């Protein structure tokens, strides 16, 4: 059996040698002459109130106006960000929700958590209420992230070291992804919706192909658990936050890490990572009660969204690119924006 | 402000009214997390507390003196704990069950208790110990075949605490054995915390009928201590 370990070590050495060969120049050296971004400041336009307990997940709509939120009081709320109105209030069967999703078409929302079920809620009914549509029931661990592809396909991640691709109408798994060795904590669908990534509490991230069911690449730069992941708008890169107080940028074709976002004053782990529209800004939420705006090319801190009284747990930037919304454990949800 | 926008504001007001009406139920409900190993005996505690008074979470409803209590036993989850234990912040109290008859896994239980106690998010959350299976511990100590000194050498130089309150007709040796384990847990309980949270020990068997009242009393004590510290009288 030892020859298997020897072969694994040999292939690992070959992979590391290829990575060293392709690393001709660091990203920072190339970006040395780029004009640094100024001090970005945001001024908390709307504060959304009404949740009774902690907030773990938020998701914007495709119209950049509607907004879903998951709280451990057992409520999903659909907000009208422009007006601070409450459109819907959906009570969940299980109070320990850990993720939520808003379908691209607007007709469905998803939720899930310690109860391993992922529940799809029909929003546009001829009866006027919001009903549970399906209850996906094949995960043997808590469900930490779920993201829609269509109105019939959803992709879930579980504490069970596996992701899945369900068929909502049937209610059965269509493909199970079984490469990780830890609890998958986050999930990010690519802009083209044929690939996606996940970080799974083993200091590694993996790129999967939705049709086939296999791990394309594996990225192993981090030191501790990976908590959040998100794609660059291009679709050829993604940033990852972790519990060792660092964010890192991975590119798929280079198959390495390009830049680590860190500071000696930060000894707290990231809980949410999102990009801006142009990819010039990387927003990351921390356990030290506030978020941070990074410059994804110069790796210099360029802002602090210090407005929360507790842990920041979720972070979303609209498709329009106009607003960023932050939810925290203080039962609030703030929508930030700039000023000219 | 258009007419439809006024109607939308009205619907939002009604939604907020229902939300406020649910806030009453939320703040009148106390959430407890039940933790234990496979041999702990948390199942019989649930059975005791429910007839009286691939799913990943079990909820148990019980009511003591018109005070609602919600308890949550974790089910179809893996053995790694450091990620889903954060969801149980801001709960009233954590209930920890230990099998005091199995000396081999006592150190594992102590390490688990230490990890729960020292976690960054569970620093304001008290723990209610349930030193389960005292009958087995008695039967094992009186019928001496397993020495506790083989696993904890400090038992040799140990004495029964002065404030011990033995049950009538109980051997001194079983009292010493049952208080040594409590002392081991309380050593971890007191070494840190800065006074923000405490451990309430209890010796329980599989035939007791007064555990819900114990949890009720301990939650009362937790809230009393919290409000006393807020008012700076303690």
């Amino acid at each position: 059996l030892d020859q298997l370990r020897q072969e694994a070590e040999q292939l690992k050495n070959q992979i590391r040698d290829a990575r060293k060969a392709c690393a001709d120049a660091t990203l920072s050296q190339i970006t040395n002459n780029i004009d640094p971004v100024g001090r970005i400041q945001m001024r908390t336009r709307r504060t959304l109130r009404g949740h009774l307990a902690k907030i773990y997940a938020m998701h914007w709509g495709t119209d950049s106006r509607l907004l879903v939120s998951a709280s451990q009081d057992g409520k999903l709320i659909i907000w009208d960000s422009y007006t601070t109105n409450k459109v819907h209030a959906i009570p969940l069967r299980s109070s320990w929700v850990m993720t939520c999703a808003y379908a691209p078409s607007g007709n469905y929302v998803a939720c899930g958590g310690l109860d391993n079920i992922c529940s799809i809620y029909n929003l546009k009914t001829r009866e006027g209420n919001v009903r549970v549509s399906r209850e996906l029931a094949g995960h043997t661990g808590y469900l930490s992230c779920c993201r829609f592809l269509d109105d019939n396909q959803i992709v879930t991640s579980s504490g069970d070291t596996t992701c899945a691709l369900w068929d909502i109408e049937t209610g059965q798994q269509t493909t199970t992804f079984t490469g990780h060795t830890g609890d998958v904590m986050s999930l990010s669908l690519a802009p083209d919706t044929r690939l996606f990534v996940s970080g799974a509490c083993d200091a590694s991230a993996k790129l999967w192909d939705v049709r086939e069911g296999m791990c394309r690449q594996t990225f192993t730069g981090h030191e501790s658990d990976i908590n959040a992941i998100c794609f660059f708008p291009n679709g050829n890169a993604f940033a990852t936050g972790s519990d060792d107080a660092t964010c890192r940028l991975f590119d798929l074709r280079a198959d390495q890490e390009l830049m680590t976002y860190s500071h000696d004053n930060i000894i707290c782990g990231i809980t949410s990572v999102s990009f801006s529209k142009s990819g010039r800004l990387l927003l990351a939420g921390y356990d030290d009660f506030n978020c941070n705006v990074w410059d994804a090319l110069k790796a210099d801190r360029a802002g602090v969204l210090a407005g929360h009284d507790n842990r920041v747990s979720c972070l979303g930037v609209t498709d329009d690119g106009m607003a960023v919304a932050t939810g925290s454990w203080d039962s609030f949800l703030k929508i930030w924006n700039g000023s000219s | 402000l258009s007419a439809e926008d006024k109607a939308a504001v009205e619907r939002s007001k009604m939604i907020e009214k229902q939300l406020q009406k649910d806030k009453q139920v939320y703040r009148a409900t106390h959430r407890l997390l039940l933790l234990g190993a496979d041999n702990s005996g948390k199942s019989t505690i649930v059975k005791q507390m429910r007839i009286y008074h691939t799913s990943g979470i079990f909820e148990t409803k019980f009511q003591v003196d018109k005070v609602n209590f919600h308890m949550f036993d974790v089910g179809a989850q893996r053995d790694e704990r450091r990620k889903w234990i954060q969801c149980f912040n801001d709960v009233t109290a954590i209930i920890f069950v230990v099998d005091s008859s199995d000396y081999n896994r006592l150190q594992e239980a102590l390490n688990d208790f230490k990890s729960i106690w020292n976690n960054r998010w569970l620093r304001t959350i008290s723990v209610i110990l349930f030193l389960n299976k005292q009958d087995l511990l008695a039967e094992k100590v009186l019928a001496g075949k397993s020495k506790i000194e083989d696993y904890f050498p400090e038992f040799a130089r140990y004495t029964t605490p002065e404030d011990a309150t033995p049950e009538p007709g109980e051997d001194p040796r079983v009292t010493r054995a049952k208080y040594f384990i409590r002392d081991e847990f309380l050593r971890i309980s007191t070494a840190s915390g800065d006074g923000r949270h405490y451990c309430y020990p209890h010796f329980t068997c599989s035939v007791d009928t007064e555990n819900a009242r114990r949890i009720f009393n301990d939650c009362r004590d937790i809230i009393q201590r919290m409000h006393l510290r807020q008012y700076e009288l303690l």
Epitope: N85, G128, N129 | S2, A3, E4, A7, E10
Partner: single-chain antibody, 230 residues
Framework: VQLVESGGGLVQPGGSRKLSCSAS????????MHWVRQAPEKGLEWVAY????????YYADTVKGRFTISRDDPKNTLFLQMTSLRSEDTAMYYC??????????????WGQGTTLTVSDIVMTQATSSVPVTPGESVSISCRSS???????????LYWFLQRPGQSPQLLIY???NLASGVPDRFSGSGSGTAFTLTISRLEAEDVGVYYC?????????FGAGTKLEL
């Protein structure tokens, strides 16, 4: 989804009567209900309105004193207490549900209507009658007095269809959106005072009378209706 109205018939002038609207098949409490009446051979006309929670009640000028609207959510019934009837109140009274949030579709279901016999923005549809053959595209125009484009981006125009012997059905809400089950043939557009409804390919089940309604401010005012005869 169903609404049934009862309590019609003859009544001597000056009397009183109560109409009931029994609902079933949807969440009655979350909907605000209306009352639209239609004279024996005239167009539609708004009467009253009660909001969800009964916290907002509006009446028409002609009935602001003698009619009372009220609802009983637990038993899913809508009431209209009529007093001091005159000869202008003879009509068919419709029970219309409406829900208001971001992206909702008000006036989406119309009850079958009850018949009662007693022994402000102006919308005009100058095209009283338009003859049209199947397969050809027809355009119906409606005009307003005040501009219906509010500052929030919405236009607040509604298009309704009434078959020869049925209750009105929603086609277009807010000048561009399409109803739940209405085919994609119907589409509408406008500028803010002038509006047009276009049928791409006329069919047999698309004849009747078409109405244009404003929801910019109360009271709600309809048009005279355009008849499409085959």
């Amino acid at each position: 989804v169903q609404l049934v109205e009862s309590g019609g018939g003859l009544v001597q002038p000056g009397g009183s009567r109560k109409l009931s609207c029994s609902a079933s098949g949807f969440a009655f409490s979350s909907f605000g209900m209306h009352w639209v009446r239609q004279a024996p051979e005239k167009g539609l006309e708004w009467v009253a309105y009660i909001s969800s929670g009964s916290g907002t009640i509006y009446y028409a000028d002609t009935v602001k004193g003698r009619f009372t609207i009220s609802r009983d959510d637990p038993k899913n019934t809508l009431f209209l207490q009529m007093t001091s009837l005159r000869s202008e109140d003879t009509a068919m009274y419709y029970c219309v549900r409406s829900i208001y949030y971001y992206g909702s579709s008000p006036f989406d279901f119309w009850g079958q209507g009850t018949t009662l016999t007693v022994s402000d923005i102006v919308m005009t549809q100058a095209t009283s009658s338009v003859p049209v053959t199947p397969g050809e595209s027809v355009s119906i125009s409606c005009r307003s007095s005040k501009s219906l484009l509010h500052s929030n981006g919405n236009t607040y125009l509604y298009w309704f269809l009434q078959r020869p012997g049925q209750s009105p059905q929603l086609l277009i809400y807010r000048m561009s959106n399409l109803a739940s089950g209405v085919p994609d043939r119907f589409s509408g557009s406008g500028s803010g005072t002038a509006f047009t409804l276009t049928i791409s390919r006329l069919e047999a089940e698309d004849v009747g009378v078409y109405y244009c309604m404003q929801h910019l401010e109360y009271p709600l005012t309809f048009g005279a209706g355009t008849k499409l005869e085959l």
